[PDB]
Design an enzyme around this catalytic site. Structure first.
Site, PDB file in Angstrom:
ATOM      1  N   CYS A 194       0.812  -1.192   0.000  1.00  0.00           N
ATOM      2  CA  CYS A 194       0.000   0.000   0.000  1.00  0.00           C
ATOM      3  C   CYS A 194       0.852   1.250   0.000  1.00  0.00           C
ATOM      4  O   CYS A 194       1.117   1.901   1.013  1.00  0.00           O
ATOM      5  CB  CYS A 194      -0.941   0.156   1.184  1.00  0.00           C
ATOM      6  SG  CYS A 194      -2.077   1.480   0.935  1.00  0.00           S
ATOM      7  N   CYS A 248      -5.488   1.318  -4.407  1.00  0.00           N
ATOM      8  CA  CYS A 248      -5.159   2.051  -3.185  1.00  0.00           C
ATOM      9  C   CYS A 248      -6.226   3.122  -2.990  1.00  0.00           C
ATOM     10  O   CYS A 248      -6.126   4.217  -3.566  1.00  0.00           O
ATOM     11  CB  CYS A 248      -3.768   2.682  -3.270  1.00  0.00           C
ATOM     12  SG  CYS A 248      -2.374   1.518  -3.272  1.00  0.00           S
TER      13      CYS A 248
HETATM   14  C1  LIG Z   1      -1.091   0.666   7.059  1.00  0.00           C
HETATM   15  C2  LIG Z   1      -1.532  -0.179   5.895  1.00  0.00           C
HETATM   16  C3  LIG Z   1      -2.628   0.221   5.140  1.00  0.00           C
HETATM   17  C4  LIG Z   1      -3.063  -0.534   4.051  1.00  0.00           C
HETATM   18  N1  LIG Z   1      -4.159  -0.090   3.334  1.00  0.00           N
HETATM   19  C5  LIG Z   1      -4.561  -0.801   2.330  1.00  0.00           C
HETATM   20  C6  LIG Z   1      -5.715  -0.333   1.587  1.00  0.00           C
HETATM   21  O1  LIG Z   1      -6.356   0.686   1.830  1.00  0.00           O
HETATM   22  N2  LIG Z   1      -6.072  -1.146   0.539  1.00  0.00           N
HETATM   23  C7  LIG Z   1      -5.434  -2.319   0.165  1.00  0.00           C
HETATM   24  O2  LIG Z   1      -5.874  -2.948  -0.806  1.00  0.00           O
HETATM   25  N3  LIG Z   1      -4.348  -2.754   0.866  1.00  0.00           N
HETATM   26  C8  LIG Z   1      -3.943  -2.029   1.894  1.00  0.00           C
HETATM   27  N4  LIG Z   1      -2.868  -2.475   2.630  1.00  0.00           N
HETATM   28  C9  LIG Z   1      -2.152  -3.684   2.183  1.00  0.00           C
HETATM   29  C10 LIG Z   1      -2.794  -5.007   2.618  1.00  0.00           C
HETATM   30  O3  LIG Z   1      -2.920  -5.075   4.041  1.00  0.00           O
HETATM   31  C11 LIG Z   1      -1.878  -6.150   2.174  1.00  0.00           C
HETATM   32  O4  LIG Z   1      -1.479  -5.950   0.822  1.00  0.00           O
HETATM   33  C12 LIG Z   1      -2.474  -7.553   2.283  1.00  0.00           C
HETATM   34  O5  LIG Z   1      -2.723  -7.830   3.660  1.00  0.00           O
HETATM   35  C13 LIG Z   1      -1.542  -8.580   1.677  1.00  0.00           C
HETATM   36  O6  LIG Z   1      -2.000  -9.901   2.027  1.00  0.00           O
HETATM   37  P1  LIG Z   1      -0.997 -11.114   2.109  1.00  0.00           P
HETATM   38  O7  LIG Z   1      -1.808 -12.384   2.394  1.00  0.00           O
HETATM   39  O8  LIG Z   1      -0.095 -11.135   0.909  1.00  0.00           O
HETATM   40  O9  LIG Z   1      -0.152 -10.788   3.399  1.00  0.00           O
HETATM   41  P2  LIG Z   1      -0.649 -10.623   4.893  1.00  0.00           P
HETATM   42  O10 LIG Z   1      -2.087 -10.340   4.922  1.00  0.00           O
HETATM   43  O11 LIG Z   1       0.225  -9.582   5.536  1.00  0.00           O
HETATM   44  O12 LIG Z   1      -0.452 -11.989   5.518  1.00  0.00           O
HETATM   45  C14 LIG Z   1       0.854 -12.586   5.607  1.00  0.00           C
HETATM   46  C15 LIG Z   1       0.802 -13.619   6.697  1.00  0.00           C
HETATM   47  O13 LIG Z   1       1.993 -14.427   6.639  1.00  0.00           O
HETATM   48  C16 LIG Z   1       2.358 -14.749   7.955  1.00  0.00           C
HETATM   49  N5  LIG Z   1       3.754 -15.148   7.964  1.00  0.00           N
HETATM   50  C17 LIG Z   1       4.864 -14.356   7.835  1.00  0.00           C
HETATM   51  N6  LIG Z   1       5.996 -15.017   7.886  1.00  0.00           N
HETATM   52  C18 LIG Z   1       5.599 -16.336   8.060  1.00  0.00           C
HETATM   53  C19 LIG Z   1       6.318 -17.539   8.192  1.00  0.00           C
HETATM   54  N7  LIG Z   1       7.652 -17.618   8.161  1.00  0.00           N
HETATM   55  N8  LIG Z   1       5.612 -18.680   8.347  1.00  0.00           N
HETATM   56  C20 LIG Z   1       4.280 -18.618   8.375  1.00  0.00           C
HETATM   57  N9  LIG Z   1       3.496 -17.545   8.262  1.00  0.00           N
HETATM   58  C21 LIG Z   1       4.220 -16.429   8.107  1.00  0.00           C
HETATM   59  C22 LIG Z   1       2.037 -13.499   8.766  1.00  0.00           C
HETATM   60  O14 LIG Z   1       1.853 -13.857  10.130  1.00  0.00           O
HETATM   61  C23 LIG Z   1       0.727 -13.045   8.114  1.00  0.00           C
HETATM   62  O15 LIG Z   1      -0.393 -13.575   8.818  1.00  0.00           O
HETATM   63  C24 LIG Z   1      -2.386  -1.716   3.720  1.00  0.00           C
HETATM   64  C25 LIG Z   1      -1.288  -2.119   4.473  1.00  0.00           C
HETATM   65  C26 LIG Z   1      -0.853  -1.360   5.555  1.00  0.00           C
HETATM   66  C27 LIG Z   1       0.339  -1.833   6.345  1.00  0.00           C
END
Ligand SMILES: Cc1cc2nc3c(=O)[nH]c(=O)nc-3n(C[C@H](O)[C@H](O)[C@H](O)COP(=O)(O)OP(=O)(O)OC[C@H]3O[C@@H](n4cnc5c(N)ncnc54)[C@H](O)[C@@H]3O)c2cc1C
Ligand SMILES: Cc1cc2nc3c(=O)[nH]c(=O)nc-3n(C[C@H](O)[C@H](O)[C@H](O)COP(=O)(O)OP(=O)(O)OC[C@H]3O[C@@H](n4cnc5c(N)ncnc54)[C@H](O)[C@@H]3O)c2cc1C
Ligand SMILES: NC(=O)CN(CC(=O)O)CC(=O)O
Ligand SMILES: NC(=O)CN(CC(=O)O)CC(=O)O
EC number: 1.8.5.8
Lengths: 406, 405
Positions: free
Chosen positions: A161, A339
């Site tokens: 983001c 975004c």
């Molecule tokens: C402040 C902020 C605002 C945001 N605002 C927006 C928005 O308005 N709109 C939008 O679309 N996106 C937004 N995002 C981005 C969005 O939150 C992420 O892009 C999304 O959560 C990505 O999902 P993911 O499953 O790839 O990762 P995540 O949801 O972060 O999940 C990753 C998971 O992997 C786990 N993990 C890590 N390492 C390991 C390991 N070694 N073994 C096992 N598990 C592990 C973690 O515990 C976590 O649960 C924002 C992010 C932030 C930080």
């Protein structure tokens, strides 16, 4: 070895979402999720938490409550991937093999690459919306701001983001006006990048806000050190190696350097940079055909967002099903990502775009304009649909609704 | 074990710094952790790939360049714990230090390209970046009959940004001298959007590219090799998802490169895995008794041996003054150099600094192809490397520059 037909690494947005879709294809008992964290967060809410508009409590749920019913939750941390023998290791010394692997490990936060962090978060006037442990500190620093510089940073790495580091600035600017202390705040955005945003239609709109609201943006300036003791911050000039700048702050919001999860950096499933190396159309791994990736941990060259995750989940669902029939994928991911930029306590610029970095708007009206409708959608509708629709596997792209509205 | 100065890596920067600090703290207080039995002056490999020099000339035993009395710990670093001032090796040995010099170089990742490295078992494909494939570059030049001669440049940081195209210019000249220039389509498929990052030399190379009918395809990155079918797959970095399968009669691979694996997750690394050092003093930003030199650092300049040499003089003084409880004075200017072989008898000596501006040692225009500079690189600088740089008596060319002007 403990074994599952479909092993999902990560119990975040992409992991849970893919787990729900896979439960319906292979049966719940044949899916496992490896996730060490006890709580699952809708991280977009944290922008408004750091601005005092939403409760931290409301952004999370226990991980156990979003695990699709009947899917096995392995509460542990992946410590190694051996795709050449279709297995992984966990920090419980458990070895798990799979027929199909879905990698959804997200992105890693590296505060400690900033000298003086995370130790400096023990002091006032400094926050970061990117962590459960520092998002409320942003709001307290914003509340307790009296006079001086209000500084907001953007690191020299990939980030999730890209809009959130400045969303909190616009909210901070608006908080100062409603509290009468705008006169006393010098607002600075020190960004490692050379532009306010990568999509012109929205970069133009934000620049208009920067001008009309007396914001300072210094480009190619990267935060390298925080002296929370002295409320000083050191920034490096990326265009002039060696040159650094010390500046006082009355509030500082830190967007941390970010990187691929450590376990992936050295893994055979990563590209040279540490990201999961997948086909940019189908999300199947480039070299291990029974491995798939989704979300922030991939090298998909688009903005890392949860909206992107949802679009990817629809594609990956079709990719995997087709490979299970030993057929060739035909549906291709377009890089959709979004975004919703919060520009104030009642307005959002809903940026939606694709692999070409061109707008791809769902609604027929011009989304580059600040809108209350889009604020309400983000703050009130989207969290509800995230817990109740996306995480159950019933939300993919908005392409359907985009074409409905023409 | 404990050492006043522990050097990680027995390469160009490692050996050079070990020699210099032998003279500061005594040979008996310096150790080098290095697992490789052979030490190479890697620039020669550009000419080995073109058949102009022998690979035997490129290397010497690691034992032959270790400064006398310095301990050679023939092992591989496996962990760094700077907060307890120690490292671990693959001997399950733990070594502590008062000062640490990290000179682990860059890591080559051929296996990120599907079909490699096993594809090197086939003919018509080589790489000058590895001792195990540089001679295959020369045989591919030899056996080339008709078709595409493909030279690649990856989408990562690189050591010697000039070498991926140097072997193209040599390959072009080889086809003229063997009569088969008519039968070779010669293309540089590069991930970048420019031929070179410093304009003065970029213009010089572009004129050479036009005059010799060379094709540059920008934003094209090798992602797979089908060595059996002599096909190479490129991704279009300007249109994510688009690819292009190309036949080749000769393929030269510049591999993706990355920080050494042990550094990727280390506390000394920045977020990208490079050793996080002050850009001017080379002292680590967060651990004041840690130092970095060479390709493994995050110093924002070209990763070259000439850069190592200039960095060794700055770091020598940086460490000396820190030992004397003083603050470093002399700044590193980002000096680096890629002497570009443009033919079997010519070199464009590119020298530049942090601001990507020329910083030529000689008063004449180094943009022009020169036999003097060819003779310097092919014959003199290897001599000066073994006999002066690795003994700690070659730093920046600043002195020679001011004299020669
Ligand atoms: C402040 C902020 C605002 C945001 N605002 C927006 C928005 O308005 N709109 C939008 O679309 N996106 C937004 N995002 C981005 C969005 O939150 C992420 O892009 C999304 O959560 C990505 O999902 P993911 O499953 O790839 O990762 P995540 O949801 O972060 O999940 C990753 C998971 O992997 C786990 N993990 C890590 N390492 C390991 C390991 N070694 N073994 C096992 N598990 C592990 C973690 O515990 C976590 O649960 C924002 C992010 C932030 C930080
Ligand atoms: C084909 C080619 C041509 C080049 N031409 C030129 C040229 O003309 N001019 C120029 O200036 N530069 C040139 N370079 C670049 C130059 O060779 C390098 O920049 C220089 O060697 C950098 O030195 P270094 O000490 O940082 O790394 P290296 O010289 O590579 O040494 C790193 C050492 O670290 C060791 N090591 C790695 N991992 C570990 C570990 N875990 N534990 C212990 N030891 C470890 C390795 O075995 C190695 O010996 C060229 C490079 C190539 C590949
Ligand atoms: N940085 C500023 O204060 C205003 N800037 C906007 C910017 O930095 O992009 C220029 C202007 O308003 O003319
Ligand atoms: N050639 C030199 O500069 C000195 N060299 C001598 C050589 O190896 O030729 C090193 C030494 O002092 O023995």
């Amino acid at each position: 070895m403990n074994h599952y037909e479909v092993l999902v690494l990560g119990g975040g947005s992409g992991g849970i979402t893919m787990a729900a879709r896979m439960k319906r294809k292979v049966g719940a008992e044949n899916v496992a999720i490896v996730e060490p964290s006890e709580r699952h967060f809708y991280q977009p809410i944290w922008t408004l938490v750091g601005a005092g508009a939403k409760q931290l409590s409301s952004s999370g749920r226990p991980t156990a409550s979003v695990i699709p019913s009947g899917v096995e939750w392995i509460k542990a941390r992946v410590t190694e991937l051996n795709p050449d023998k279709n297995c992984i290791h966990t920090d419980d010394d458990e070895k798990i093999s799979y027929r199909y692997l879905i990698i959804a490990l997200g992105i890693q936060l590296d505060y400690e690459k900033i000298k003086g962090l995370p130790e400096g978060f023990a002091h006032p006037k400094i926050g970061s919306n990117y962590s459960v442990k520092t998002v409320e500190k942003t709001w307290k620093a914003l509340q307790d701001f009296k006079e001086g510089n209000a500084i907001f940073t953007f690191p020299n790495t990939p980030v999730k983001c890209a809009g959130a580091p400045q969303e909190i600035m616009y909210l901070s600017e608006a908080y100062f006006r409603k509290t009468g202390k705008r006169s006393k705040a010098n607002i600075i955005f020190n960004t490692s990048l050379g532009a306010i945003f990568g999509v012109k239609k929205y970069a133009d709109a934000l620049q208009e806000i920067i001008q009309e609201r007396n914001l300072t943006v210094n480009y190619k300036k990267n935060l390298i050190e925080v002296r929370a003791d002295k409320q000083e911050a050191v920034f490096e000039n990326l265009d002039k190696p060696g040159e650094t700048q010390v500046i006082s702050y009355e509030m500082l919001h830190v967007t941390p350097p970010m990187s691929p999860p450590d376990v992936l950096k050295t893994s055979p499933v990563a590209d040279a940079a540490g990201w999961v190396d997948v086909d940019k159309e189908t999300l199947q791994h480039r070299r291990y055909p029974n491995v798939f990736g989704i979300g922030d941990c991939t090298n998909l060259p688009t903005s890392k967002t949860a909206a992107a995750v949802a679009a990817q989940s629809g594609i990956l669902d079709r990719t995997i099903s087709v490979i299970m029939k030993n057929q060739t994928p035909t549906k291709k991911y377009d890089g959709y990502t979004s975004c919703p930029l919060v520009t104030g306590y009642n307005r959002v610029i809903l940026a939606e775009f694709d692999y070409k970095a061109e707008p791809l708007e769902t609604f027929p009206f011009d989304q580059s304009k600040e809108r209350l409708s889009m604020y309400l959608m983000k703050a009130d509708l989207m969290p509800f649909l995230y817990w109740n629709m996306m995480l159950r596997g019933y939300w993919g792209g908005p392409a359907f609704l985009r074409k409905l509205f023409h």
